[PDB]
Ligand binder design. Structure first.
Ligand code: CA
Length: 279
């Protein structure tokens, strides 16, 4: 399949070179997989989601996304126009309030929720979770991410937007999950992207067009934007039978575009997510 005039990030993940605008992907498109978006919620009624999105949990007085950030992330995972895995099922878990804030205890509960809740969903090709959030180092937050992964969910988490070493951030610093840094349209590390040995992969994170609340669309930037590219990619690869939740991060790193990013600090992986699709 070919989607012309795609957001640059989708084009990038299906390309061996920057500077193209068509996204190429196998038509299976993540069908039969599920991706949890643990964030501010998802505006499931957005036409871009086509009835494939659902809120399954909130820790606040509403499950609606009153922020937009969760909707944007979900859009990058699986919206018709702006998504990597255009046929995946999206499940929203609102651990962040409408200001994008959440207490670590709520974030942890949301992770353990997903580890159980996948048993209540139909996801024959596998389960993924996208965590576009973070704060300072917490062993408890890291452990929750590790549990979610261990339970059979491909966990992708943002590296963080501090232009600092991700070792000091959670869940970014958890070795057993997939920690995702951000790049720009010209294959430069995003100016704000964290780095360090704990990163596993980079994805497109600067100026990413996706869905927003009020049935709209929006370009924003962050490792929060790179993460769902990787999460959607995992779902897509799992539907293809190429990998599984336990090894998807490794497989993505193994099959990535290598050594093509600039401004990667010494010691950080130079790996950009790539679907290796031969149209
Ligand atoms: Ca790892």
């Amino acid at each position: 399949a070919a989607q012309t005039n795609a957001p640059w990030g989708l084009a990038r993940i299906s390309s061996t070179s920057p500077g193209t605008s068509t996204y190429y992907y196998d038509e299976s498109a993540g069908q039969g997989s599920c991706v949890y978006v643990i964030d501010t919620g998802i505006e499931a009624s957005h036409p871009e989601f086509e009835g494939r999105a659902q809120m399954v949990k909130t820790y606040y007085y509403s499950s609606r996304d009153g922020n937009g950030h969760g909707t944007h992330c979900a859009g990058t995972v699986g919206s018709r126009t702006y998504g990597v895995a255009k046929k995946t099922q999206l499940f929203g878990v609102k651990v962040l309030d409408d200001n994008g804030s959440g207490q670590y205890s709520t974030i942890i509960a949301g992770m353990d929720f997903v580890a159980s809740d996948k048993n209540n969903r139909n996801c024959p090709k596998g389960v993924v979770a996208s965590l576009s959030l973070g704060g300072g180092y917490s062993s408890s937050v890291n452990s929750a991410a590790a549990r979610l992964q261990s339970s059979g969910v491909m966990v992708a988490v943002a590296a963080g937007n501090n232009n600092a070493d991700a070792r000091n951030y959670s869940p970014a610093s958890e070795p057993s999950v997939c920690t995702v840094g951000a790049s720009d349209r010209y294959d430069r590390r995003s100016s704000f992207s964290n780095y360090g040995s704990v990163l596993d992969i980079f994805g497109p994170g600067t100026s990413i067009l996706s869905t927003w609340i009020g049935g709209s669309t929006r370009s924003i930037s962050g490792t929060s934007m790179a993460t769902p590219h990787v999460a959607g990619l995992a779902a897509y690869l799992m539907t293809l039978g190429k990998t599984t939740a336990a090894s998807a991060c490794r497989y993505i790193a193994d099959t990535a575009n290598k050594g093509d990013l600039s401004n990667i600090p010494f010691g950080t992986v130079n790996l950009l997510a790539y679907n290796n699709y031969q149209a």
